[PDB]
Amino acid sequence: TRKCVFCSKKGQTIDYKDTALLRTYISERGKIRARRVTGNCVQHQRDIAVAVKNAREVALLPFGS
Amino acid sequence: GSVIKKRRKRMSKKKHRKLLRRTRVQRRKLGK
Amino acid sequence: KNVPHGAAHIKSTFNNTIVSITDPQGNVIAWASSGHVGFKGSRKSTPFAAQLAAENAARKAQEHGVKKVDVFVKGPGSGRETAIRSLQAAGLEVGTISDVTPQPHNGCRPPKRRR
Amino acid sequence: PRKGPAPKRPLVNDPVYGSQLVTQLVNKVLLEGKKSLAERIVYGALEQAREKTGTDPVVTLKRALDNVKPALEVRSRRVGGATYQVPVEVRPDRSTTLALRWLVNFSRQRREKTMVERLANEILDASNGLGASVKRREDTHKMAEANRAFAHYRW
RNA sequence: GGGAGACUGGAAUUCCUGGUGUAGCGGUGGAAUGCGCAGAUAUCAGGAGGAACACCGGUGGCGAAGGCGGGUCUCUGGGCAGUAACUGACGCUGAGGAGCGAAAGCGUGGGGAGCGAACAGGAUUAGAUACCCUGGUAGUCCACGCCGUAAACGGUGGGUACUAGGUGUGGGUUUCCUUCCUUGGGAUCCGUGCCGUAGCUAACGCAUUAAGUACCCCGCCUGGGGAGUACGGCCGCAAGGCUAAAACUCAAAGGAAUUGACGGGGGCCCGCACAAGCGGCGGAGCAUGUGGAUUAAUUCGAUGCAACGCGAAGAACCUUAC
């Protein structure tokens, strides 16, 4: 709960092709990290989630190691 | 409330449905 | 035969423990369970039973020349570290520990609860 | 108990040998208030270790001090719901006991009549450290290292 | 995660096929039934089909309520905030009426992986039409209809105005310092929680999201059983649903809280209660005392810990009561 980077005027854009940004918020085994730890806001967690999920379906991230 | 009132009414409900089941074919006869 | 490197698959549930040593592809070359050790009944799930099954299965695998084995565990049984430590005592010189337990993504309905 | 005890009797230094380590054993091997007869054996049992080997009883102190040294074994608990063993640091009182139960107390079964020459023979073997009693010390040695990697609880 | 249509993703369970591979697998407090020894379980590869969507995910969001979360596209409903441009009381409630309405259930046609009322065995038990175990059919799923009831509960009808606050959290607006990001603080609108005054309550408790202070409209109540039952009527393919009495009988039925008692409820703490250590009993012979007995009596008691070298601290007669 330190802060929501994404939720920053100075923050990136969440896409389902930027595999890099997502690694930051998925675990060592696909798990989408929670919001308590990651710290993100509610609106943007919802984003990382729909991203990680779409990505996995276009085969850019493991469906879980 | 207390559950005694509910299981007091439940027994009358349970007993009555049994009576309808047992007399299901006889009721359809005298109902003609 | 003669295969120096292989894989060990340990399945340990609340009722039993099955150890099978395999080639790097998956073919079974030596298997031994707690029931094949001699236990029968509720004793299959005990830590003692798993230790003997791994000891017996490793002995048969050493007869075929396996020298190093890679271990995959699966199941909630108590005899998991006991199955591993028995493979060390026989001297199979285990490789890396892993863990492959099938967890569904909310698929089929679990059976009725127990009272 | 529930608070913590104290060592009541003191390990008094020996009057003729000046070693509480001997004092540990003369009272550890004992009978029905027979410190008179216990005095007879405990000096009549290292007596052969003085003469049969030829080395003085001070050397008898040295050899049996270093020959039978289990000094660290394992012990059971509730852990695992079974007989899981964890190594524990033990005072050598439970170490000489490991040999005492096969010592001159048990050395009767070997065909060794002529009362105390056999009890001198065993404490002679107690000096040896390769005799009959050390087997259990070896038996628990192989048992402790049978569960060698079972110390992660470390009680 | 408001709703409907269409396409589509993978992890697992099952089954089929083919390798490796022997003698067990499964299940429980323990077992048996069962599956195998004709090649099971295990294990690797390929395939078939159906249902539900781990992580995100919670005292968080949305919908009038029921309820709603795998991804994408198409169609569509509601809500809040800001500006005050627009009509100018067009508001509120709403008897009957109409629509929506979890689950189970009914009809016609598909589908059926897992789970599984009924039904079989196996086991426990004095008995098992049960809990436990192995199997298993309607159903659970889809399309179109029907049913219309639930602890359909905040057990709290709808609208409006007022009445101390503190602290969380979900949306939308803006002043004070600015790094010029935001959990910086400040104010205001709308949700959703915890605590707490005035006040209210029989008490529990409610307390700006009232069960406080007032106004408008609707529903309902008038002791407990008989009974939400019968009769009549309406609806329904059927199950049944809606409206709804009387005779008779009882002197109570009830709501809240206090104190003990109890629990096959929980926590903590003590005792040779365990763990550390020593020695015994249980195996042999004999002393004593009980039970089972035979008999003429084998006197009367004691019966679990708290009876059994106990009333006995003296049965050759006396004792002694048979």
UniProtKB/Swiss-Prot annotation, chain A:
GO terms (BP aspect): translation
Superkingdom as given in the UniProt entry: Bacteria
Keywords assigned: Ribonucleoprotein, Ribosomal protein, RNA-binding, rRNA-binding
Keyword Metal-binding belongs to the record: no
Record carries keyword Transport: no
Molecular function via GO: small ribosomal subunit rRNA binding; structural constituent of ribosome
GO cellular component: cytosolic small ribosomal subunit
Quaternary data: Part of the 30S ribosomal subunit. Forms a tight heterodimer with protein bS6.
Function: Binds as a heterodimer with protein bS6 to the central domain of the 16S rRNA, where it helps stabilize the platform of the 30S subunit.
Family: Belongs to the bacterial ribosomal protein bS18 family.
Protein name in UniProt: Small ribosomal subunit protein bS18B
Species annotation: Mycolicibacterium smegmatis (strain ATCC 700084 / mc(2)155)
Lineage of source species: Bacteria, Bacillati, Actinomycetota, Actinomycetes, Mycobacteriales
From Swiss-Prot, chain C:
Disordered: annotated span: 97-115
Keyword terms of this UniProt record: Ribonucleoprotein, Ribosomal protein, RNA-binding, rRNA-binding
GO cellular component: ribonucleoprotein complex; ribosome
Entry's Gene Ontology BP terms: translation
Record flagged with keyword Ribosomal protein: yes
Ribonucleoprotein found in the keyword field: yes
Record-level Gene Ontology MF annotations: rRNA binding; structural constituent of ribosome
Origin: domain of life: Bacteria
Subunit structure, as described in the record: Part of the 30S ribosomal subunit. Interacts with proteins S7 and S18. Binds to IF-3.
Family (UniProt): Belongs to the universal ribosomal protein uS11 family.
Protein purpose: Located on the platform of the 30S subunit, it bridges several disparate RNA helices of the 16S rRNA. Forms part of the Shine-Dalgarno cleft in the 70S ribosome.
The protein's name: Small ribosomal subunit protein uS11
Organism (species): Mycolicibacterium smegmatis (strain ATCC 700084 / mc(2)155) (Mycobacterium smegmatis)
Taxon lineage: Bacteria, Bacillati, Actinomycetota, Actinomycetes, Mycobacteriales
UniProtKB/Swiss-Prot annotation, chain D:
GO cellular component terms given for this protein: small ribosomal subunit
Assigned keywords, A-Z: Ribonucleoprotein, Ribosomal protein, RNA-binding, rRNA-binding, tRNA-binding
The keyword Magnesium belongs to this UniProt entry's keyword annotation: no
Record flagged with keyword DNA damage: no
GO biological process: translation
Sections of the chain in a coiled coil: none
Residue ranges crossing the lipid bilayer per the database entry: none
Matching PROSITE patterns: RIBOSOMAL_S7
Domain of life: Bacteria
GO MF term set: rRNA binding; structural constituent of ribosome; tRNA binding
Family: Belongs to the universal ribosomal protein uS7 family.
Quaternary assembly: Part of the 30S ribosomal subunit. Contacts proteins S9 and S11.
Function: One of the primary rRNA binding proteins, it binds directly to 16S rRNA where it nucleates assembly of the head domain of the 30S subunit. Is located at the subunit interface close to the decoding center, probably blocks exit of the E-site tRNA.
Protein name in UniProt: Small ribosomal subunit protein uS7
